[PDB]
Design a protein around this ligand. Structure first.
Ligand SMILES: O=C(O)CCCC(=O)C(=O)O
Length: 299
């Protein structure tokens, strides 16, 4: 009979970031399919640790899910000593929603138009400039620290509570540049409020096919990306996980769903619950190496 009443999707960041943008798309589609409201609960704090600690404790009845992030599943262990939950044991996978490029951008008043211009400008002014971090341990955060190690540039991190307040400060010039998820940055690109330099992925993003990759623009072998999930509390009934996976997978694999995701700067995910588990395990192992190379660890 599930669902017989309202379902909550817990989202670990405020609105105007990529996590909430994908959650709203999913919530609308699930609501229509099942005839019950799927509502969003924006529960910010500690790079998603407060949200994840909460969902780890709720009843495993199918009326609460987590919209997971690389932090919650893989990277927060690199910057936080204690987290309030154990991502390996406390959840059961549902599906990977999307794989998403990150984007290097600068504030308009910084007089640089390419990755090579940025590296020169910063090498001339070591330890003077500032960059925006959407959250401690985010793929943006670790992407910039890897870029720093691979190019020799010295620039100072300023953490924020999500992409939304960070990007407001980048538009004002209170930070000079960022690497962060494409969907959140794209409306600012299109309003001309920030200047895009390059994508972080191994291949160009086709709908912005004339922005180069960081690797082709001067940093050989550089590759990073972000991603987003639906997770359930340990013990959620198999029938419920399977139904929810099937419904989301149908949306993501549809022509119309693929178009909707790509228009906002995201590639559809899809696959099985165990495919999500494989992606999480690979990412744990790959980011732990990046963190060591870049000199990042928990205080
Ligand atoms: O790439 C990541 O680690 C996810 C960062 C998500 C975010 O900052 C937001 O939704 O506001």
């Amino acid at each position: 009979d599930w669902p017989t009443r309202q379902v909550t999707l817990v989202v670990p960041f405020t609105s105007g970031g990529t996590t909430d943008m994908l959650a709203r798309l999913i919530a609308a589609r699930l609501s229509e399919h099942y005839g019950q409201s799927f509502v969003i609960d924006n529960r910010s704090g500690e790079s998603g640790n407060i949200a994840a600690s909460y969902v780890a404790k709720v009843p495993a009845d199918g009326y609460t899910f987590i919209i997971g992030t690389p932090g919650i599943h893989a990277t927060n262990r690199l910057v936080y000593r204690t987290m309030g939950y154990d991502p390996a044991t406390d959840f059961t996978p549902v599906i990977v929603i999307a794989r998403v490029p990150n984007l290097l951008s600068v504030t308009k008043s910084l007089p640089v138009t390419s990755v090579a211009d940025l590296i020169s400008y910063a090498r001339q002014r070591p330890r003077e400039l500032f960059y925006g971090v959407s959250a401690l341990g985010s793929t943006g955060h670790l992407s910039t620290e890897l870029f720093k190690t691979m190019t020799g540039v010295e620039i100072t991190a300023v953490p924020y509570k999500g992409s939304a307040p960070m990007l407001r400060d980048l538009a004002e010039g209170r930070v000079h540049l960022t690497i962060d998820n494409l969907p959140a940055s794209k409306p600012l690109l299109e309003a001309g409020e920030i200047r895009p330099l390059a994508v972080t992925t191994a291949k160009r993003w086709p709908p912005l096919s004339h922005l180069p990759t960081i690797a082709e623009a001067g940093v050989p072998g550089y590759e990073t990306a972000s991603w987003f999930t639906v997770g359930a509390p340990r013990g959620t009934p198999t029938e419920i996980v399977t139904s929810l996976n099937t419904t989301v997978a149908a949306f993501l694999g549809s022509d119309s769903g693929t178009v909707k995701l790509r228009e906002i700067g995201a590639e559809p995910g899809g696959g099985s619950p165990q495919d999500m588990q494989r992606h999480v395990e690979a990412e744990i192992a790959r980011w732990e190496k990046v963190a060591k190379t870049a000199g990042i660890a928990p205080l």
